[PDB]
Structures are given as C-alpha cells and as structure tokens.
Write a protein that binds this DNA or RNA. Structure first.
Ligand SMILES: [Mg+2]
Ligand SMILES: [Mg+2]
Ligand SMILES: [Mg+2]
Ligand SMILES: [Mg+2]
Ligand SMILES: [Mg+2]
Ligand SMILES: [Mg+2]
Lengths: 80, 131, 135, 199, 156
RNA sequence: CUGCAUUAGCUAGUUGGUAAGGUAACGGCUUACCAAGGCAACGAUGCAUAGCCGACCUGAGAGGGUGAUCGGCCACACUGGA
RNA sequence: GUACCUAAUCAGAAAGCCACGGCUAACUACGUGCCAGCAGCCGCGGUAAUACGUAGGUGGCAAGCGUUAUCCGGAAUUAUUGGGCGUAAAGCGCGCGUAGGCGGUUUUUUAAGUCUGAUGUGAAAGCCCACGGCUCAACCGUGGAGGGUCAUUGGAAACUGGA
RNA sequence: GUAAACGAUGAGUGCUAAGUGUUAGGGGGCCCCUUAGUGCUGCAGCUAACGCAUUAAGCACUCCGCCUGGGGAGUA
RNA sequence: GUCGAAGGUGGGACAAAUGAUUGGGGUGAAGUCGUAACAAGGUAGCCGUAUCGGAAGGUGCGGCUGGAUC
C-alpha cells in the first residue's frame, strides 16, 4: 500500500562495487531575498548488478538501511 | 548585452513619454505585442501597429496625451526581473495606485491585467506596473 | 548590490557595545573564570576615594571612588549628592551611568545602600539620593 | 473618588467646567497657580493633545491606566476610534447614573455606586467601572430608596439623554441604546486624543 | 485661510563689524478644503516676516484631491533630500504625521492619513516634499477622463 | 534549524563488497578477507557558543531579539565505566 | 466557619514619587557664586541662575513613582520591502579567463519553478474574533479564525527551467 | 607589484533635443547624408550643490568590486 | 583470555594568566624646540618610492591638479 520516496538524478561516481552515487538537483529559495538557487544532494543507492554507469540519468527509491550510508535502490535507467 | 526586452520596451515608452514623442518603433515579440495591446485596451497608449518585416518584426506604438498636453502614462515599473522574479497568487494580486493603475501579469490564461487575474482567480508572474 | 551579490554575501548589521561593561560580567570563584550575566547593580569595595578635576570647560572638584567590584573589575564611580561618608574599604553599591565631565568615571554609587549614606538636608528628589522622608 | 483634588483648579487649568455648571470658569477663567493671572503663553501641539486627553479623563473621573485601557478596547471595537471611545466612556455605570440623575455630581454618583446603593438588573454592583449595555436597567437599593441625597437629586428635573429612559417614581432607568456623538459632550475633540495616544 | 508658522529661524550675515541678524519665517496657509500653500518671509522682526510669508503662501496655492477626508491613493513626495511617504487611512485614523508635514496636511484639510518622513527633516524641504506629493496625487474622475473611460470601466 | 576561512583540506572501520557473528530490528553494529574508496568552497575538518519547540517581547509590516512560568520532545542524577 | 450575605458605629485608621532650559506637560523668590553642585544629549554654575540647594506654586502619575541593567523601536544607521560609491566612506591600476549569475526571435512538446482545487496533518495551552461565568476587570471556559518553505492527488500552460 | 596607477567616474546593452570643431573612412549632389573616435557649448532629466548632459553623473536590465561616523590604523 | 574506566609515561597542538624590560597609541594641562600645512603660507601642495636629518620635514625620480599672479 504505502509507497516510498522516489528520486531521479544523474550518476556522478561508480567506483564502488555494486554502489552508485546519484546526484539529485533541487532549487531552494533564499528565505529573505527570494531568489532561486541550485541545491545538489548526493544519494548513495544500491546497484546490485552494476547496470548503472557514470553519467546516465537513473531513478532510485528509498529502502531500509543497506549499508553505512546507502539508503536507496536503483529502479530503472531512464536515460544514458 | 540585452537581458530584458520587456524592460527595454517599458523604458522606451518611458523615455518617449518624457520627451512627449508621438510614436515609438521597437523590435517586436509576442510578449511585447500582448503588453502593447493591453496598454491600448486600457487607454494608456493611443494605438499599436505591427510590422511583419524581415528579422524580428517591429512594434509601432502611438502614445496618448490628454487635454493641456497632459501625459496619460505617469510611470512604468518593471517588477519581475531576470535577476529576481516575482510571482503572486490570486488573493495576493497587488493594486496599483489603489486601483487607478494596472499591473500587467503573465498567467496560464494569457497575459492579462490584475483586475482580470483577480476576476478569473489566477496568479502568475507580475510583468510590470503601469500608472 | 545585486540580488546575487546579496545571496552570496548577506548583509551584516553593526554590533552594539554596552556602555557599562563592568556590570555585564560575573566571576565564578570555584572555576576562577568570568561569566556573562547582566546585572543592574554590583557590590564593590572602595579601593580609593578622592576628588577629580572635570575636563574643560567645566571646573570643580568632583567626588569619586575607585571601586573593586564583586567580579574583580576595578572601575571609577562618581559619588552623587552633597557630602559623603566613604573612605577606602567602604562597601558600596554601583549602578550604571557615566559622568560626562569625568573621562574615566562610567558608573554611579547608589546613595542609601550598603555603606554609602543618604544626602544630608536633601528634600526634593530624595529617592535619587537615599534620604528618608524628614516628616 | 480616587482623585480628591481641587476640581475647580482642574477646570481652570483645562478650560472646561467639569461639573457642567460653569461656576469654576465664571469668575476666574485662567489657570491656577502663582502665574495663573497674566498668563499669555501659547501651547504646543503636544500640549494641546495632552490638554484634550486630560479634559476627557478628568471629566469622566478616571485614572490614566484605566483611561488608556478603555481607549484600547474602544480602538478594538468596530467603527470610529474616538467616537467609540466616547460612547464607551458614557456607557460606564458612573456616567449612566449621573445622566439618569440619581446624583447631582459625577463624583457623588461614583461614591453612591461604590458604596453599593445602585443595582443593575436587580443585582448589586459596587464597581463604577462597570460597563452598561443596551437593554439593561439601573435601580436603587431598597434600604437607600429614601436617601436624602438621592431624593434631592431626583427632585431637580435634569435632562435625560435619548439613550436613557428614566422613571423617577420608581427611580428606575433603562439603557435603551448606545449613545451618539451628538448626545455626548461636544467640548471634546476626540481626534486630538486619538493622536495623543498615537504619540 | 488658516495659517500656521512652521519654523522661525535666526540667520546671520557676517559684516566688517559684528553680524547682521535677520528673522526668517516659514508659513503654511490652507483653507482646509483641499487648498494649501507655503511661503517664506524675511524681515528684521517676526511679525513682519510672518506677514510676508503668509502673502507668499497665499500667492502660491495647490489643490489637493481628497476622498472623504483622505487622499485618493498612496504617494511619496520628493524634493531634494526631503521625502514624505503618505498613505490613505480610514475614518478616525487621524493624521499620523510629524513636523511640517502635519501642518501641510491639516491645512489642506486631510484628517485621516498615515505618513513617514523618510528623508531630510529640514522643515522647508519637508514641506516641499509634502507639497510635491500632494501635487502628484491623482483623482479617479480625472484619470478616467485621461484614459478615455469611465470610473466603472476603470475599476472593472 | 548558529557564529568564525586571521579554520582548507578531512577520513583507514574510513567508503563499498563477500562471509560470519551480534541485536526487537536493518546496517561497518562488530570481526576476518578483496578493492581504494568516501566527505569537502552547495564550506568538509577544526574552533567557539547553544538543550529544541509550542511560544514570548518588539515592529505598520518585512523583520529583529528571546527560549522564565505552563505543555511536548531530548538529555542528565557527585565524576567515569559496567 | 474561609468566601459571600444580613444588622449596627464612625470621615473617622488609609498619599506618596518624580519633574518644571529645549526635546517635554509645568515658573517665581531666596542662598551659593566656574565653588558647592547638575547633566540622557546640547550644556547649566565666575553675584539679579525658570538648569545647582531650599521654599511656594505648577505638571505627570498614584499604591505606586523614579534610577539602573537588558531587548525591540524610533535607525531607510546593512536599505528584499527600503541606501549608496565624480568631489561627502565607497570602482580592484589594467587585461586574459574558470566556476557561478544572467541571457536575442519563432513553432511543437514536458510540467521542475509558477497558478488553481480536493484530502491529511500543522497537539493542548497561547495571540486574534465572538459568546458565556466570576458584582466588573484581570482571570476562567466554549466555539471560530489564523499559523507550512509541509505531504499525496487532480487541473491550467503565458512566463522561467528541460527536450 | 606599488602611485593623485585619475576622467578621484567597473564592464555590457538599449533608449532620450540640439549647435559646433577635429581624426580615419563611406555614400550622394563647394554642399548633403552616414559609421567610428576625439573636443567644446547646450535642452529634458539628474544632483546637496558644484556640475553631468548621445564620450551622462539621465532613463532602464545583467554581472562584478566596494562603503556603513572620526581617531586608534592600513596599525597589532 | 578478549574488550575495558581510571591511572602512568612521552612528544607535540591550542587557549588563558603572568613576566625584568620594551614599542608605538590615546588622554591631560597655559611645559620645551622649532614653524611643516592653510594666502603665491612666503621653496605650490599632495601621491608612490629612495635616502638623509632633533622634530616637524628636506632632497632626488616619476605622477596628479584636489595649483598657478602676470
Ligand atoms: Mg550549555
Ligand atoms: Mg572619497
Ligand atoms: Mg578604473
Ligand atoms: Mg611654512
Ligand atoms: Mg611652503
Ligand atoms: Mg638634504
């Protein structure tokens, strides 16, 4: 029933075995001056088969803790 | 280089109004044409013509002066800018000069005035103030 | 500045200094250190008592005391009113408020508190000088 | 009352007969004090605002704190701030009793209500600050129905405002509706008081 | 026409021996029905300075559009470094203004308004800024005529 | 959701994997082996300060300041470990 | 045996604090004489001081009134709202350039920003509005209203962003 | 690696009366028009004033650098 | 037997207080020496740099007008 958060982002490093780090980009607004400013957050997600490669735009979903800092799992590779 | 054609058009109008010129030729664009048509409909300018020439096209505005040569356009102010963009909700639409002026707005229902935005209950990017 | 400049380096307000620094500091004897506590008055002991000549254009012999406060800070405190019964080792209460004429005197001694006696013969604005109602 | 000073000196200061008779201003319409006579100085705007505020306050025999609180609540009421403040001042039990005429003086009415000779809707009210509202009735205590002071005051057929309906036979008044500015004294410029409390 | 003396100032011109002192009077004149003006007068004595200032003010008057005792819309009058922001209020608000601005507004007859002097507080430039704002005020009927429409069309 | 760059490098169980143990529970939580990863000018690391919040004071507002009483959450019980 | 109610006696027990040169409401006399002293700032005091001390009078408050300390305001004096940089403080001595910021005209498309609904939630108490109860008020209770940069979900496509 | 390194005036872009000199060009009949500089005078507008004014200090938009009373001190 | 608080030893880091003596800074008077700047300030001044001199300053080189009578 209840679904879990899903994010789409580019892969910025895959040197780890079966792990890819996904860079999700957002635009937070300055609380006083109101301007839109870029915000990048790197997500450590599980890559079981090493299918994802550095550069491709992938989709990840939140899971239970899988490692010290891995909390997400790769769902599909939207683009490459 | 050029960074805000809407601001350039408003400043052309302001300078021509100051010098009490009659007409005004500026490079054309769809947003500029809609702004000019709104100005004509509201009564701040006398007329608008479009010249579909080569390149970009041209907008030819004809300004309106009241009796005693009084200027109908008191002032134009760019509100949303490339360096900082301003949007407003329907319930937060501003009243220019307590209602005596118009705020040109860009909405999902076309670029309209603040009166129309409030009536249709929509918001959008507040392009400019004209009073 | 541009909005981008303000986002990159936001505006910074001027910092305000207190006019009575010695009242804003306590002393913890066990840890032998100072602490930041705001007090309206502090007790002290008159290390010295005497008179000072005001800066020009004024001329007078203004009565003052060098006082070591409970927080171990040594300050100069003006003695208000006509006549005082203070000498070295007198225990006095000190409040804020500088005397413009006296350069280094930034505090006042409360009258009618601890050792300091009320002004004798004062009848108008007595509370400011610690004098009981004569009746 | 709480203020027990020379009401004549206060009237002379403020240039108004707080009692309404005019006795204070008849002979010496100038200010009290050594410099009272031969006074010719001109008041600043702040002085004028202060004088207007003090006129209203001493007219209604209130203290500064309660006066300010009443001004605040009047400002919180819908309408014109000054007019609302004046009508609320009128709606006080002291003012209502004085207007009904159960006493000749505002201070006398205050002392009567303070000592409890009055009843609102048939119940005792000792607090002159009590705020009456339309549809209420002001009566007199049975043990005090035949007091010399009250009967003497009722004898003098004083004018009864339109917002009050009084029957002297029963010593019973009714607060019909809220007053209006015309009914309220015109010697007060409420705008000056509003500006005073603005600054 | 009611008249109020805003400020009286003792100015001095230096001469070979001593100084020459003169009195300058700044005065505001208004009928309290939408007409207000200001003037300055110089004389050796304040009564004559005031009289000259009153004459100048009566010579120079401006018409202040109003709406039930308040201005048609908010305006910021500017002159030199003077700057006065003025905003319509509701009945019973009072005139929330300080210094010469209050004199100008009261003599123009405005009884309910909010204002703030944002610039120089020198009385003459304060008055000039206030007068500039009042001159630049606009009224619904006149703006409708200028734009070739009706009041109802103007408000939609 | 805080100040400092007159703090620019930090990290080696550290980052990931395989296996095992362990716990109510996932997980470097721990331990062996394989690789060299991981964080950081979008401010890491370091230093200084601080219980957090509902709220409270102030201001026309935007904001600025505060975190008594009362309620929620966290932490602690002479200091440290079990 | 507290509140409260009933009956009797007496104006009799129950007023002080600061200020009065401008700001800032309130001025005269005497004493002192750049001394004694005052002072928030400008300053006041050297012999006729509304500024010192006392007196009378006056002003503001009142069971409080003043002083001190601290915060916000006034301060547009860090300026988003809402300031500036020729001479008042402020354009790097000047290039080449990375990141970032921003970006010319038209069409199609997307719906991240933007706009508009629904649903959940944003405890209670508190601020605000209304009502009700203590003789009134503070206070107490009830019902509203508001508070998100919140989350899911359906719609719009001018503008910014992607194709 | 600093100068009163100055126009004590950051860069880019567009718009807003005119008169007149000069440098390098271009087009049309000694004259007219025009592009890019370099000077002087001068409206509107701006400025506290002085002044600026199509080579803005005017009207606007983008980015950068810089200021927040004097001294201590461009010092420790 | 593993882990393990406290403790011990060692070389570093950081912070605060204090220290013979010493450097310039401010303040205070009616002190001493000169007179550098403001007028053509009596050698126009000022900016950077070098050097010299009790001191202000002088001189050299370049720069500015925020100087220049006739
Ligand atoms: Mg702590
Ligand atoms: Mg400068
Ligand atoms: Mg330069
Ligand atoms: Mg010389
Ligand atoms: Mg010389
Ligand atoms: Mg030499």
């Amino acid at each position: 029933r209840n679904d879990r958060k899903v994010y789409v982002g580019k892969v910025v490093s895959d040197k780890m075995d079966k792990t890819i780090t996904v860079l999700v980009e957002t635009y937070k607004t300055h609380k006083l001056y109101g301007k839109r400013v870029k915000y990048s957050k790197k997500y450590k997600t599980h890559d079981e088969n090493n299918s994802a490669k550095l550069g491709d735009i992938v989709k990840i979903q939140e899971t239970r803790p899988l490692s010290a800092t891995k909390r997400f799992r790769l769902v599909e590779i939207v683009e490459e | 280089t050029m960074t805000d054609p809407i601001a350039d058009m408003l400043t052309r109008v302001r300078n021509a109004n100051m010098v009490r010129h009659e007409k005004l030729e500026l490079p054309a664009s769809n947003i500029k044409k809609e702004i000019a048509e709104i100005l004509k409909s509201e009564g701040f300018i006398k007329n608008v013509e479009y010249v579909e020439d080569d390149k970009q096209g041209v907008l030819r505005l004809f300004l309106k002066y009241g009796q005693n040569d009084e200027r109908v356009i008191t002032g134009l102010k760019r509100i949303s800018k490339p360096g900082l963009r301003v949007y407003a909700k329907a319930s937060e639409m501003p009243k220019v000069l307590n209602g005596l002026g118009i705020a040109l707005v860009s909405t999902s229902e076309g670029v309209i005035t603040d009166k129309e935005a409030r009536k249709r209950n929509v918001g959008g990017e507040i392009i400019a103030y004209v009073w | 500045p541009t909005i981008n400049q303000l986002v990159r380096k936001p505006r910074q307000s001027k910092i305000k200094k207190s006019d009575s620094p010695a009242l804003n500091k306590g002393f913890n004897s066990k840890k032998k250190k100072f602490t930041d506590l705001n007090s309206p008055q502090k007790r002290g002991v008159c290390t010295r008592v005497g008179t000072m000549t005001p800066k020009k254009p004024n001329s007078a012999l203004r009565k003052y005391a060098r006082v070591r406060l409970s927080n171990n800070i040594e300050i100069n405190a003006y003695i208000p009113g006509i006549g005082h019964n203070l000498q070295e080792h007198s225990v006095v209460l000190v409040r804020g408020g500088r005397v413009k004429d006296l350069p280094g005197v930034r505090y006042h001694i409360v009258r009618g508190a601890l050792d300091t006696s009320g002004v004798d013969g004062r009848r108008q604005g007595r509370s400011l000088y610690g004098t009981k109602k004569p009746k | 009352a709480r203020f027990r000073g020379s009401n004549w000196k206060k009237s002379r200061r403020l240039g108004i007969s707080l009692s309404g008779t005019g006795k204070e201003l008849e002979k010496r319409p100038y200010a009290p004090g050594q410099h009272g006579p031969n006074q010719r100085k001109k008041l600043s705007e702040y002085g004028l605002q202060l004088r207007e505020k003090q006129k209203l306050r001493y007219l209604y025999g209130m203290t500064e704190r309660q006066f300010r609180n009443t001004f605040d609540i009047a400002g919180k009421k819908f309408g014109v701030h000054g007019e609302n403040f004046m009508i609320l001042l009128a709606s006080r039990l002291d003012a209502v009793v004085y207007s009904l005429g159960l006493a000749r003086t505002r201070r006398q009415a205050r002392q009567l209500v303070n000592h409890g000779h009055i009843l609102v809707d048939g119940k005792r009210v000792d607090i002159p600050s009590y705020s009456v509202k339309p549809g209420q009735t002001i009566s007199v205590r049975e043990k005090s129905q035949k007091l010399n002071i009250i009967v003497e005051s009722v004898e003098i057929n004083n004018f009864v405002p339109e917002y009050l309906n009084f029957d002297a036979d029963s010593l019973t008044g009714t607060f019909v509706r809220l007053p209006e500015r015309s009914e309220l004294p015109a010697e007060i410029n409420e705008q000056l008081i509003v500006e005073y409390y603005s600054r | 026409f009611e008249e109020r003396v805003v400020t009286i100032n003792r100015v001095a011109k230096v001469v070979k021996g001593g100084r020459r002192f003169r009195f300058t009077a700044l005065v505001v004149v208004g009928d309290k029905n939408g007409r207000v003006g200001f003037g300055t007068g110089k004389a050796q004595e304040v009564p004559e300075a005031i009289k000259k200032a009153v004459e100048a003010a009566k010579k120079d008057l401006v018409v202040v559009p109003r709406v039930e005792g308040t201005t048609p819309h908010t305006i910021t009058g500017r002159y030199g470094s003077g700057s006065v922001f003025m905003k319509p209020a509701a009945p019973g608000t009072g005139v929330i203004a300080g210094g010469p601005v209050r004199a100008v507004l009261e003599l123009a007859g405005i009884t309910d308004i909010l204002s703030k002097s944002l610039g120089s507080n020198t009385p003459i430039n304060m008055v000039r800024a206030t007068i500039d704002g009042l001159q630049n005020l606009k009224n619904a009927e006149d703006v409708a005529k200028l734009r070739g429409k009706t009041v109802e069309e103007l408000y939609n």
